[PDB]
């Protein structure tokens, strides 16, 4: 019944500050090493900070210098990561984990931290229409272009979740503009183009944006 739940992740301008939280359950942080580990999109794991049991000594990666501060509240049973002077390269999913005497055997679900000068924006949704050249020998490809949103993440479903087979929702790409964009595609039988309706359901929580888009030939 051991669980770690994280919070506090979000968007900040470079040079700004953010406090992450890691709420523990089924154990108290007083008796264990607690670690913070982050992961940039597409990259490997990077250890960030740790705090010792009983006495609360700390340790930091060289990359987070005297910018980050790790601490724990044993009464509230929560560990924290105070992040100051944030830079763009600090953008990552941050995980908190419990050490057991050995390794980190329990992990949080992770929280996304985005550092950028760009401002929050809902996406524009454009159809990737099927045609005589999006088809071949029976199957046609169609999709939705989810363009110019910030920050991550965007979620996409098809026909309110009923259509999952043949669905490819690609990783978002960070455009030079500073805004993100992703495509979601699906391959369907060409004969269904006249009958079946195909709707991509786009959700962008950071802007409370919900957009449907019916994709037609």
């Amino acid at each position: 019944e051991v669980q770690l739940v994280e919070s506090g992740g979000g968007l900040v301008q470079p040079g700004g500050s953010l406090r992450l939280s890691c709420a523990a359950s089924g154990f108290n942080v007083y008796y264990y090493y607690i670690h913070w580990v982050r992961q940039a999109p597409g990259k490997g794991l990077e250890w960030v900070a740790s705090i010792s049991p009983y006495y609360g000594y700390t340790s930091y990666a060289d990359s987070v210098k005297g910018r980050f501060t790790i601490s724990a509240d044993t009464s509230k049973n929560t560990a924290y990561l105070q992040m100051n002077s944030l830079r763009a390269e600090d953008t990552a999913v941050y995980y908190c984990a419990r050490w057991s005497y050995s390794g980190m055997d329990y992990w949080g679900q992770g929280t996304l931290v985005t550092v950028s000068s760009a401002s929050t924006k809902g996406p524009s949704v454009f159809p990737l229409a099927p045609s005589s050249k999006s088809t071949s020998g029976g199957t046609a490809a169609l999709g939705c272009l989810v363009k110019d949103y910030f920050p991550e993440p965007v979620t996409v479903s098809w026909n309110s979740g009923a259509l999952t087979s043949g669905v490819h929702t690609f990783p978002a790409v960070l455009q030079s503009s500073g805004l993100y964009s992703l495509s979601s595609v699906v391959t369907v039988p060409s004969s269904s183009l006249g009958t079946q309706t195909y709707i991509c359901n786009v959700n962008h929580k950071p802007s409370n944006t919900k957009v449907d888009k019916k994709v037609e030939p």
Partner: protein, 200 residues
């Protein structure tokens, strides 16, 4: 801090991962297994997973690879005043060569009316992952005005899919006629080119 190295393997294969160490000698190790979209998992080894130290390098061995073992593995080393994660090895499923099916999508009229233009090229269900997409605008080879991303290995047929997006201003899009993406891949004896003429 860098992209994970890729390793192609099959069920039943033996896999040995070497942890690239530093000023170790007095160093300890922990191994982790991560799958897309999820937090890493601590690996308990000794029984399919075993480990040992050969010199300063820690090793993790998978005796007989199972389909649930296909993942990205990391080693964690910790010593006096030092904690670091190694690069990461992504063990992916090896399968027969599969050529991509290629689709090209002009900018929607909706996007054009909105003052912009995105051309999308789709590469569907191919293996291996390695694929090169080349954009051509009026037979001029493009570079620096397109971005691509690739899905993880498909849970259905162990293939990959890729989408390449050519971004142009509306005005620049409308002064060119022929748009093409040229696809190069293992499964293609000759490069496949999908194209369209603007406004057909």
């Amino acid at each position: 801090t860098q992209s994970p190295s890729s390793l192609s393997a099959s069920v039943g294969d033996r896999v040995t991962i070497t942890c690239r160490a530093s000023q170790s000698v007095s160093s300890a190790v922990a191994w982790y297994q991560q799958k897309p979209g999820k937090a890493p998992k601590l690996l308990i080894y000794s029984s399919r997973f075993s480990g040992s130290r050969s010199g300063t390098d820690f090793t993790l061995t998978i005796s007989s690879l199972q389909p649930e073992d296909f993942a990205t593995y990391y080693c964690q080393q910790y010593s006096y005043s030092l904690v670091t994660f190694g690069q990461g090895t992504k063990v992916e499923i090896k399968r027969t060569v599969a050529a991509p099916s290629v689709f090209i999508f002009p900018p929607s009229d909706s996007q054009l009316k909105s003052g912009t233009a995105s051309v999308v090229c789709l590469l569907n269900n191919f293996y291996p992952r390695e694929a090169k997409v080349q954009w051509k605008v009026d037979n001029a080879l493009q570079s620096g005005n397109s971005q691509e991303s690739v899905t993880e290995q498909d849970s259905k047929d162990s293939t990959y899919s890729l989408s390449s997006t050519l971004t142009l201003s509306k005005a620049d899009y409308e002064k060119h006629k022929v748009y093409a993406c040229e696809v190069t891949h293992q499964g293609l004896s000759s490069p496949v080119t999908k194209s369209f003429n603007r406004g057909e």
